[PDB]
């Protein structure tokens, strides 16, 4: 099959009208507004009349809550009100009323509610919104528990009774019209008698599995029967209808899965529409995320052209006025209504996903947002689109869904004097819009109809996305919020958004406080740009660029300083299809690898002499080149490395980000005194063959070191292209040599006499072999050769019973199986609290079977091949061993076309204990364990016990659990309520501890400092906190008379950055934190008393404990230590028995250092970051031991939108 011949063909040819929609997707905001202002303009007479009507409605609204009266009656604090409603919610989970009342009277009111009632406070963020109007993303469950005890002990049964009755009313009658469709229908008769109509919302969305989509289907079908029976021939305008969400009806509702959507989702909608046709009721397709808009149009088109649905005008469709495509979508819909002769019911809304759209465009590095960023722009867009709809009432049925009295009044007068039922209507939300619309419906008011959008569902169903619904009308910019704010005048509320926009100095300017994705980092650096795989223009352009990349004769050669070298040449094959030859590699002889190091050494002074700013300029130029070449680079990564387009885009972004980040960090730090190490050997893996390749090399180069680049033998072509780009950007050939080949080439480079440093990403075993070889050598200055190694992980995610299953499953499927699990960060062990384990596991297995595995030149492929047949064999041997032990194994079936490549099906293996898993299994293999809540702390121990410490995830809403878990886990990259993959340079600096590597973190501020002989002070690198054991030690030194060492100890205490705690700039809806902690226990190998004191001061000032070499004979130098210091001090004769250590400090002459370095490399377990100094160096240089390498970096990324919305926005 020809590469990319079927990458992403559209569902249908894009008509002129469809293309005008796509063209507007991310149009600059200043370009969208002027035509909207013009279309929204009305006569001065109309504007005055509309302001009068709006003032009249608002005066009525203000002239006429339950939770607030309850808070007042019992003098509750906010936390008490929230805690009370959480208790009421839990009591309502008890089905029998008499049982519940007995528990309240006999057990709850009397004392400890904790012994009788899953945290009570799982939904406290929602109840917090109800009580306070403010959204907090996580729940302070200890504060709520205290508040609940306090209020119960103060007020007793009466307050509990009142809370229960209040929650019962709100959850049964306010947030929903009824629990079931029959109950909702019964409660609809009252307002139907007043002139209202209804559209029922069954509260389904985001199917994760086929079974869940089928459940949502049968729920919609049963509701259509009930609504149609009740409609009883009233028709689509007077009678009730239904609203559906396409995401409820298929678990893979996305553009990437468009073929499955048209084949599998479309027939389901058609079947529901046929039933709606027979009863003659409305069936409305709700609008969802911006990347689903254009896909949904293909379903609308097919349905409106399907003759089986003819004769029925009930098909409806929502368009969101906050979207830049809205008027063009309306043009398309009106034309479709004309062609089909179906009077499409068009619900105009403003839009419910605003904060999520802002976050998504920022995360994806896209050109602009697909929605407006000023609320007034959405208001003008709405009015302009209403004008378009009101001119087409013969062709469509406009439905103006809004609670904004000003918007309503403007449209009411825009529509003019003539009205008949069926011309158009208004719409509102149940339990929210009735106060406004009771001033609209009826001959005594404005005599215009209103359809009530009526949620229907149980308590569990309505709570799932209640936060997003509350924010529709609850944000500070929301009309319903502002009308209830006394500080907001009626004049402010009736302000005409059209005229306000028209008079702004720059019409349609972007919000001042929302950064475009490119500007996320401000003046520090330019964000890399992504590509929108939902944009048909992008998919069409990418299709051609990808095909063109597959026709190129890609090569990789040994590129020595003197020119390309001869060698053994072989082809490079696509891992997804070995018949697809991607290019040819000429591999490096061991002789030429040694020669390359000599040439690098000869060239080292000339590269070091290029000033740091100019070296950084080379990196910035290379980043521009990679950005411009992204589509071609994507094609090569897809075919050579077996990656999906989505992952290839992110990888090229990461490479660009490394180049720009290290360039900026260089401009912030490097001066004449930060001399280069010399030739650095950069050994890189096949799983991030551009990004990690580029990151290591760029850092070494910009620090002033010439580089020998040894790429993974599986992925030399993208590496050769990366070197070509860096050379084009100005890196001299003598500064950057490419040495393709296998481990023998890597080993020859490591062992070469002039090698001054090694940067390695790959296996622990190979890093250990490199460490053993480097320990044989010292630099010309008699110091160890630095090794930076990142070596993978055994990464866990802990999920408690407060987490949202659908969120968990999505993050798990992505974290475990993205890139076929070939990320070092991939989720390996999912840990499920016992009470939710079976439900989440069922959902996870169902989601597993929705993944498409195959050759990655198709947008529809989710999981590609593993890199080699040997990798495949190793992974499969692990799976079969687990199966042979009787562990439950779930696997997706592989298509026959996978046989030409090396594929492993995504797999779920259920384990009894974490210790059942003994080694990192570098493939799409998720292990699942269950835990009881009281065993959480033991579980964290179990996770730490593997010895790894790279990525870690936690899904919980509860602050106590966040605090506990994050304080006890020992990993470098933590992720809360999100996936654990795709660390962003400079936002989640990436790297771990233990068996996961040495540090410092790539994409972090300590990285460049390891690549120079004297480390600079990184930006923001300081701490006002002083370690108290360090202070006790300095006092002990003064008491012993060691006044010089006591001063040095105090200086180390101040110099240490232990306790640094920063928030890094990044996308909205996330908090990204970076902190410096102690490393652990540092091995001290002193030679003199003063050396031991200096070593102890360095280690204690950075928060560490120590093990001191008993063979030093210096035990008598540490007599009568304070207990606080003694607690941190042990003496070690057998270093291997007393580990693991987290670093080492060595004192001695060159031969002593070499001997100790060899002994240290022989210690089992983690590679130790070793620092050595002579006694004279300790006396001359206060920084003989650099404190940068005695702290541990920790990155934590918290998804603050996880509760369903973004409070900050
Ligand atoms: C009957 C019915 C049916 C639906 C919906 C509402 C109603 C009444 N909604 C929700 C709707 O889109 C909207 O979020 C709420 O109705 C509130 O908007 P109003 O016009 O009431 O108020 P209001 O006039 O106060 O407008 C609030 C809206 O302004 C927008 N906004 C806020 N800040 C902004 C900013 N900084 N920049 C740009 N825009 C900003 C948002 O769209 C926000 O919801 C919806 N929504 C949806 O996406 N799909 C759907 O299928 C439905 N269905
Ligand atoms: N941390 C990560 O991101 C990576 C970790 N791994 C782990 O390693 C396992 C094996 O995969 P491999 O590709 O075998 O990784 P590997 O670690 O053997 O290869 C990594 C790099 O080291 C080079 N290399 C191999 N032996 C060497 C030696 N003796 N001296 C110097 N350089 C040497 C290779 O050529 C490649 O460039 C994987 O299954 C996975 O567990 C591998 C690749 C990525
Ligand atoms: O599309 C057309 O040409 C005809 C006109 C009326 C409805 N269909
Ligand atoms: O976090 C991730 O998924 C990638 C893997 C290497 C570093 N960044
Ligand atoms: Mg290998």
């Amino acid at each position: 099959p020809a590469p990319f011949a079927d990458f992403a063909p559209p569902v249908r040819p894009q008509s002129t009208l469809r293309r005008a929609i796509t063209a507007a997707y991310r149009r600059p905001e200043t370009e969208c507004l002027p035509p909207l202002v013009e279309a929204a303009t009305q006569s001065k007479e109309i504007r005055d009349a509309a302001a009068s009507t709006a003032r009249k409605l608002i005066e009525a609204l203000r002239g006429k809550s339950g939770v607030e009266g309850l808070v007042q009656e019992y003098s509750l604090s906010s936390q008490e009100g929230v805690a009370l409603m959480c208790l009421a919610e839990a009591l309502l989970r008890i089905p029998d009323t008499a049982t519940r009342d007995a528990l309240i009277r006999d057990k709850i009111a009397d004392g400890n509610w904790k012994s009788h009632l899953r945290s009570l406070f799982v939904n406290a963020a929602t109840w917090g919104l109800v009580v306070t109007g403010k959204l907090t993303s996580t729940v302070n469950d200890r504060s709520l528990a205290a508040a609940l005890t306090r209020l119960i002990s103060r007020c007793g049964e009466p307050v509990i009774r009142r809370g229960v009755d209040m929650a019962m009313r709100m959850m049964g009658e306010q947030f929903v019209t009824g629990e079931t469709i029959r109950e909702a229908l019964k409660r609809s008769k009252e307002l139907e008698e007043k002139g209202f109509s209804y559209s029922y919302d069954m509260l389904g969305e985001a199917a994760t599995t086929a079974a869940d989509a089928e459940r949502y289907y049968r729920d919609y079908e049963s509701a259509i029967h009930a609504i149609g029976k009740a409609s009883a021939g009233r028709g689509i305008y007077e009678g009730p209808g239904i609203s559906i969400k396409l995401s409820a009806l298929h678990p893979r509702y996305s553009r990437a899965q468009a073929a499955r959507v048209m084949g599998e989702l479309l027939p389901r909608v058609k079947a529901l529409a046929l039933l709606a046709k027979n009863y003659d009721i409305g069936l409305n397709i709700d609008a969802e995320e911006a990347d689903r808009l254009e896909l949904s149009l293909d379903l609308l088109e097919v349905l409106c052209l399907d003759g089986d649905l003819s004769g029925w005008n009930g098909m409806g469709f929502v368009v969101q006025a906050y979207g830049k495509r809205c008027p063009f979508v309306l043009d398309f819909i009106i034309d479709l209504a004309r062609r089909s002769g179906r009077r499409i019911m068009v619900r105009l809304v403003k839009g419910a996903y605003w904060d999520a759209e802002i976050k998504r465009a920022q995360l994806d590095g896209l050109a602009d947002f697909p929605v407006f960023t000023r609320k007034i722009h959405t208001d003008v867009s709405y009015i302009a689109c209403a004008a378009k709809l009101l001119a087409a009432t013969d062709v469509v049925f406009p439905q103006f869904a809004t609670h904004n009295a000003q918007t309503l009044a403007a449209i009411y007068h825009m529509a003019g004097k003539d009205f008949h039922v069926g011309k158009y209507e208004f719409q509102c939300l149940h339990g929210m819009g009735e106060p406004l619309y009771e001033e609209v419906v009826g001959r005594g008011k404005l005599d215009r109809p209103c359809r009530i959008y009526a949620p229907v569902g149980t308590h569990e169903t309505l709570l799932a996305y209640l936060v997003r619904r509350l924010l529709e009308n609850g944000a500070n910019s929301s009309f319903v919020h502002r009308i209830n704010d006394p500080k907001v005048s009626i004049d402010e509320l009736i302000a005409d958004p059209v005229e306000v926009v028209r008079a702004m100095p720059v019409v349609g300017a972007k919000h001042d406080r929302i950064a475009l994705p490119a500007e996320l980092f401000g003046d520090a650096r330019t964000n890399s740009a992504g590509l929108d795989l939902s944009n048909e223009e992008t998919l069409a352009s990418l299709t051609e660029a990808l095909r063109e990349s597959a026709a190129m004769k890609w090569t990789a050669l040994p590129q020595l300083a003197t020119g390309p070298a001869a060698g053994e040449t072989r082809t490079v094959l696509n891992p997804g299809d070995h018949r697809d030859v991607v290019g040819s590699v000429t591999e490096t002889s061991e002789e030429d690898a040694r020669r390359a190091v000599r040439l690098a050494a000869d060239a080292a002074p000339d590269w070091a002499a290029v000033p740091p700013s100019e070296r950084a300029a080379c990196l910035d130029r290379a980043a521009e080149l990679m950005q411009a070449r992204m589509p071609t680079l994507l094609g090569l990564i897809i075919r050579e490395a077996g990656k999906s387009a989505l992952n290839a885009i992110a990888e090229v972004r990461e490479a660009i980000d490394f180049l720009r980040y290290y360039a900026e960090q260089t401009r912030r730090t490097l001066g004449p005194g930060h001399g280069p190490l010399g030739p650095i050997v950069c050994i890189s893996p096949w799983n991030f063959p551009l990004a990690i390749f580029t990151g290591q090399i760029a850092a070494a180069l910009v620090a002033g070191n010439p580089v020998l680049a040894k790429p993974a033998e599986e992925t030399p072509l993208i590496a050769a292209e990366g070197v070509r780009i860096l050379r084009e950007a100005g890196i001299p050939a003598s500064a950057l040599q490419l040495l393709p080949g296998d481990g023998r080439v890597g080993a020859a480079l490591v062992a070469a006499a002039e090698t001054a440093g090694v940067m390695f990403t790959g296996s622990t075993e190979v890093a250990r072999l490199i460490q053993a070889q480097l320990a044989d050598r010292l630099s010309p200055a008699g110091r160890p050769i630095p090794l930076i190694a990142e070596t993978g992980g055994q990464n866990a995610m802990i999920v408690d019973s407060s987490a949202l299953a659908e969120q968990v499953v999505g993050d798990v499927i992505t974290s475990a199986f993205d890139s076929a699990g070939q990320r070092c960060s991939a989720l390996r062990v999912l840990c499920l609290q016992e009470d939710v384990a079976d439900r989440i596991l069922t959902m996870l297995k169902g989601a597993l079977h929705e993944l498409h595995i195959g050759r990655t030149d198709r947008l529809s492929v989710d999981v590609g091949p593993v890199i080699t047949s040997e990798a495949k064999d190793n992974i499969e041997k692990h799976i079969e061993r687990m199966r042979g032990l009787g562990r439950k194994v779930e696997q997706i079936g592989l298509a026959s076309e996978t046989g030409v490549g090396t594929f492993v099906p995504p797999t779920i293996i259920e384990l009894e204990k974490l210790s059942d898993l003994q080694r990192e299994v570098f493939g799409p293999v998720l292990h699942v364990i269950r835990y009881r809540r009281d065993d959480l702390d033991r579980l964290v121990d179990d996770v730490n016990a593997t010895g790894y410490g790279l990525t870690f995830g936690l899904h919980t809403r509860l602050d106590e659990t966040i605090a506990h878990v994050t304080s006890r886990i020992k990993a470098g990259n933590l992720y809360i309520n999100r996936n654990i993959i795709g660390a962003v340079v400079g936002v989640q600096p990436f790297g771990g501890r233990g068996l996961s590597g040495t540090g410092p973190k790539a994409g972090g501020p300590l990285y460049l400092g390891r690549l120079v002989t004297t480390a600079p002070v990184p930006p923001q690198h300081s701490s006002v906190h002083t370690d108290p054991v360090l202070l006790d030690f300095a006092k002990w030194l003064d008491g012993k008379g060691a006044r010089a060492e006591a001063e040095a100890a105090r200086n180390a205490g101040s110099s240490s950055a232990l306790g640094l705690d920063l928030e890094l700039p990044g996308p909205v809806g996330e908090r990204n934190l970076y902190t410096l902690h102690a490393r652990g226990r540092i091995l001290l190998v002193p030679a003199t008393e003063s050396g031991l004191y200096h070593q102890l001061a360095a280690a204690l000032a950075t928060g560490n404990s120590v093990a001191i070499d008993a063979a030093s004979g210096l035990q008598a130098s540490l007599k009568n230590l304070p207990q606080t210091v003694g607690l941190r001090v042990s003496w070690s004769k057998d270093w291997a028995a007393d580990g693991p250590f987290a670093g080492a400090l060595v004192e001695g002459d060159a031969e002593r250092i070499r001997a100790v370095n060899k002994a240290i490399a022989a210690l089992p377990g983690p590679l130790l970051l070793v620092q050595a100094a002579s006694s004279g160096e300790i006396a001359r240089n206060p920084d003989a031991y650099c404190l940068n390498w005695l702290v541990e970096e920790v990155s934590a990324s918290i998804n603050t939108a996880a509760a369903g919305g973004n409070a900050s926005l």
Side-chain angles (χ1 to χ4, degrees), residues 993 998 1077-1082 1102 1104 1142-1143 1169 1189-1192:
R993 60 169 326 281
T998 57
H1077 303 255
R1079 285 180 86 89
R1081 190 170 297 270
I1082 306 298
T1102 47
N1104 299 291
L1169 199 167
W1189 322 126
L1190 288 163
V1191 291
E1192 186 167 288

Side-chain angles (χ1 to χ4, degrees), residues 706-731:
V707 167
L708 302 314
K710 214 299 292 180
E713 56 267 32
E714 298 88 352
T715 57
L717 304 175
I718 187 66
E721 175 67 7
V723 167
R724 189 195 64 72
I725 287 170
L726 279 159
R727 284 177 172 196
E728 184 186 336
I731 302 295

Side-chain angles (χ1 to χ4, degrees), residues 683-688 692 710-714 741-743 745-748 750 760-767 769-770 790-793 822-824 867 871 920-922 950:
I683 292 169
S684 57
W686 45 266
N687 62 335
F688 281 83
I692 283 167
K710 214 299 292 180
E713 56 267 32
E714 298 88 352
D742 60 23
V745 182
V750 170
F760 174 83
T761 303
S763 67
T764 57
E765 299 94 328
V766 170
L769 288 170
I770 290 170
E790 182 250 284
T791 51
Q822 298 177 132
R823 293 182 186 255
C824 63
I867 189 67
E920 175 190 61
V921 181
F922 210 68
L950 190 49

Side-chain angles (χ1 to χ4, degrees), residues 751-782 784-807:
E754 305 91 345
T755 293
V758 177
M759 305 176 78
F760 174 83
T761 303
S763 67
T764 57
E765 299 94 328
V766 170
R768 186 172 288 116
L769 288 170
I770 290 170
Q771 178 200 35
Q773 160 63 224
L774 292 180
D776 203 57
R777 286 139 64 198
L778 297 171
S779 69
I785 305 296
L787 171 61
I788 303 185
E790 182 250 284
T791 51
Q794 189 68 279
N795 311 302
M797 180 188 285
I798 297 180
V799 175
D800 74 13
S801 60
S802 72
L804 181 63
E806 285 83 356
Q807 275 186 342

Side-chain angles (χ1 to χ4, degrees), residues 990-1046:
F990 184 80
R993 60 169 326 281
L995 302 174
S996 295
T998 57
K1001 285 178 169 279
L1006 283 166
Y1007 203 66
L1008 296 184
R1010 190 75 171 119
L1011 307 176
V1012 288
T1013 57
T1014 305
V1017 180
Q1020 305 191 278
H1021 180 89
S1022 67
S1023 176
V1024 300
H1025 303 291
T1026 307
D1027 180 281
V1029 181
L1030 178 282
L1031 286 175
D1032 286 353
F1033 179 60
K1035 281 190 304 200
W1036 176 88
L1037 287 168
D1038 269 329
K1040 291 293 181 187
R1043 132 91 212 194
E1045 290 80 8

